[PDB]
Amino acid sequence: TPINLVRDLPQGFSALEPLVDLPIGINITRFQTLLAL
């Protein structure tokens, strides 16, 4: 997005374009972001 705005999220619109679908399946949960230091 062109997101610079001022604060919080704006009133706009746009959509995500898929890239790939890998065959893990196997009962996914507990997504965990990877924070840096």
Add this chain to the structure above:
Amino acid sequence: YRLFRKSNLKPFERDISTEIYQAGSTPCNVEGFNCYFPLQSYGFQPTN
């Protein structure tokens, strides 16, 4: 193959775990009767 499972697996689901099942009404914590190893072997022999 897997003979004991707490719940039926969803389509295209893989269950490699070795979770001991409580098939018997008596809870376990553990072999022989009333709770067994989930997997069961095959007797594949040429005479079969």
